[PDB]
Design a protein around this ligand. Structure first.
Ligand code: CDL
Ligand code: MQ9
Ligand code: 9YF
Ligand code: HEC
Ligand code: HEC
Ligand code: 9XX
Ligand code: PLM
Lengths: 158, 54, 223
């Protein structure tokens, strides 16, 4: 009776770095920050990108995506009202394929944030995604999409 | 019985500060030499850089 | 590719939209969202066959794949385009790499396997048990691409080994060790499975002890 109403397989989040925020009609999937850090912190004043996918649940739509801004002044370049029983893919997560030579509306709604606050990988930073339906804090992580190991200096025994 | 100390739900906590390791004291006093030089002054050593900007 | 994306979408729409809802978002309490899973996850999971899954239980078992390599690639490309994420390795031609994933070093691969893989699988990649109905399966069926993608995307209750955590060279070494341990003949006779104490004790008690008792019954006289 591992197959009962509470089963391990069904109640599993995706094995992805981005968090999931189902609150609100539009569901946020694989929401993370591309913020390549060269040191302990990503210093304020540097622009890091905000990846996620906004999937519409209802066909009756919530395609506004008004502000979705928090501490950092997230700006949505190439903003569009995409979600209509479909996906709004703000950016290009590492490994993303354009899927066609051309493109629609230039960039596909790329979200970029001027930090105004140090951030580091491993921490969770709250972002308030607000559609016309409602607002939800998501606690976005920092994800190193596909970058390999940065060479750490060799150690001199002492 | 159960372990005396467990289950502290309250006090959510805080993010650890950036670690600032203290230098090794006389115990592990060994450290890398910063550069040997004559140093006929207060001391500069065998290491000195500079950036000429515009 | 356009046609590859279209084929992946058509397969997705008539295979999994009931549990990975259309738009790749996950159906609450039926399946996780596939945004960000990537092409490697799709390749491993569908090729091992786990994904045409017909039950929600402790663990999704392996099974014959429901799609051929071309359809696996189509589904993987569709999922990668929708979400974007890790990609399965490929060789010079374009096919999923099998021999290229055999790392040169096998001692290093074995050390890494013992530190990370044997934790649950086995000393030599036989299966292992887990908490509640789960289990780490035997690795002898997996091919190098399947092992590499299994590490790349933690399939289920398995830690996700990123390239940063296990550089592709380390993963190639682990793949080499897995294949070598799986394809290596047991020196010293029939390795009874791969578990020493339990299969060895059963074989003692059944083969050696029944032989000894039967010989004793032959020699002696019932009374
Ligand atoms: C699990 C799998 C196996 C685990 C244990 C298996 C036990 C099988 C032993 C069979 C031995 C037997 O029948 O021998 C007689 C039988 C005939 O020889 P015999 O010349 O008639 O014997 C001289 C006398 O007749 C004297 O012998 P006997 O025929 O009068 O004795 C018969 C029987 C009488 O005792 C009983 O009736 C015992 C019944 C036990 C049943 C429990 C099972 C319940 C399961 C339900 C729960 C599950 C949930 O005694 C036993 O064998 C006691 C076995 C108790 C162990 C139960 C383990 C559980 O032996 C054979 O031909 C082959 C036997 C090979 C076994 C070698 C090991 C012997 C070491 C101990 C035996 C006891 C000393 C007797 C000598
Ligand atoms: C703590 C504890 C014992 C918990 C319960 C776990 C347990 C032993 C459960 C039973 C295992 C079984 C019998 C599973 C099949 C499903 C099941 C329960 C069916 C109903 C049982 C039933 C009433 C059937 C009708 C008649 C009946 C009693 C049939 C029993 C059938 C069997 C399996 C008989 C032989 C007993 C047997 C092999 C038990 C498993 C125990 C061990 C330690 C096997 C060792 C062993 C292993 C594990 C290898 O992998 C291996 C690989 C390569 C070479 C050799 C071996 C080897 O010897
Ligand atoms: C009486 C004295 C005689 C003793 C038996 C001696 C037999 C000698 C055999 C010949 C020489 C040694 C061959 C060694 C080559 C070799 O090892 O043999 C394997 C086979 O293995 C199996 O499957 C088992 C096949 C079934 C036949 C053997 C069964 C004998 C058992 C019953 C003896 C013990 C008694 C226990 C009693 C049980 C009842 C208790 C109530 C075959 O390869 P494979 O099958 O592919 O192994 C997989 C890797 O590949 C793959 O990666 C790996 O991942 C694995 O999957 C691995 O299995
Ligand atoms: C218990 C933690 C765990 C560790 C750590 C782990 N595995 Fe796994 N592994 C599993 C589980 C559980 C599965 C089954 C996943 C599924 O069926 O969806 C699995 C699946 C696999 C498979 C698929 C085999 C098949 O035929 O489907 C391979 C190959 C594999 N693991 C090898 C590895 C490698 C290589 C590593 C690198 C160290 C590793 N394991 C580390 C638990 C683990
Ligand atoms: C409920 C039946 C079921 C169907 C049918 C199904 N999936 Fe899934 N899927 C799941 C479950 C449950 C998980 C997570 C647990 C697991 O994988 O065992 C999952 C996870 C996945 C993963 C891995 C996610 C991760 O984070 O590693 C991929 C890739 C995937 N599904 C793709 C597919 C594809 C492609 C198909 C159709 C070819 C499909 N699934 C059909 C239920 C299903
Ligand atoms: C006192 C000893 C005698 C028994 C006394 C009366 C014993 C009376 C036993 C009532 C049992 C009531 C169970 C209530 C279920 C529950 O609420 O929990 C749900 C759980 C989550 O579901 C499960 O996980 C599995 C549940 C199914 C059990 C399959 C057992 C099959 C047995 C076979 C393996 C054959 C064994 C051979 C057995 C051979 C015996 C044949 C009779
Ligand atoms: C998951 O591991 C099993 C799910 C099965 C749940 C329903 C069980 C029905 C009852 C079966 C009766 C068994 C025999 C009773 C002996 C007295």
């Amino acid at each position: 009776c591992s197959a009962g109403q509470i089963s391990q397989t069904t109640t599993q989040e995706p094995a992805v770095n981005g968090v999931n925020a189902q609150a609100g009609q539009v569901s946020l999937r694989n929401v993370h920050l591309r913020a390549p850090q060269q040191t302990d912190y990503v210093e304020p004043g540097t622009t890091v990108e905000l990846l996620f996918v906004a999937a519409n649940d209802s066909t009756e739509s919530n395609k506004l995506k008004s502000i979705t801004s928090d501490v950092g002044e997230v700006t949505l370049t190439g903003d569009s009202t995409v979600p209509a029983d479909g996906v709004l893919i703000v950016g290009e997560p590492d490994g993303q394929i354009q899927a066609v030579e051309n493109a629609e509306a230039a960039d596909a709604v790329t979200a970029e944030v001027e930090l105004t606050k140090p951030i580091t990988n491993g921490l969770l930073y709250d972002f308030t995604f607000t559609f016309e339906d409602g607002e939800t804090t998501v606690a976005v992580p920092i994800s190193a999409g596909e970058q390999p190991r940065r060479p750490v200096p060799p150690a001199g025994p002492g | 019985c159960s372990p005396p100390g467990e289950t502290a739900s309250s006090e959510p906590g805080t993010t650890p500060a950036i670690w600032t390791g203290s230098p090794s004291p006389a115990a592990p006093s060994g450290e890398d030499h910063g550069g040997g030089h004559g140093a006929g002054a207060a001391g500069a050593g065998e290491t000195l850089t500079a950036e000429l900007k515009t | 590719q356009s046609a590859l994306l279209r084929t992946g979408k058509q397969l997705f729409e008539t295979s999994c939209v009931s549990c990975h809802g259309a738009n790749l978002q996950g159906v609450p309490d039926r399946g996780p969202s596939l945004i960000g899973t990537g092409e490697a996850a799709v390749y491993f999971q569908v090729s091992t066959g786990r994904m045409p899954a017909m039950r929600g239980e402790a663990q999704a078992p392996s099974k014959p794949p429901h799609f051929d390599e071309s359809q696996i690639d189509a589904l993987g490309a569709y999922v990668q385009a929708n979400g974007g994420g890790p990609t399965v390795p490929r060789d010079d031609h374009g096919a999923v790499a099998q021999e290229s994933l055999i790392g040169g070093d096998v001692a290093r691969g074995g050390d890494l396997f013992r530190l990370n893989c044997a934790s649950c699988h086995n000393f030599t990649g036989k299966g292992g048990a887990l908490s509640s109905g789960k289990y780490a399966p035997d690795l002898g069926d997996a091919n190098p691409a399947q092992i590499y993608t299994a590490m790349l995307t933690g399939p289920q209750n398995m830690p996700k080994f990123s390239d940063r955590q296990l550089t592709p060279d380390e993963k190639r070494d682990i793949v080499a060790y897995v294949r070598e341990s799986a394809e290596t003949p047991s020196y010293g006779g029939y390795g009874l499975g791969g578990f020493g104490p339990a299969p060895e004790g059963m074989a003692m008690w059944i083969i050696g002890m029944v032989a000894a008792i039967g010989v004793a019954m032959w020699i002696g006289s019932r009374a």
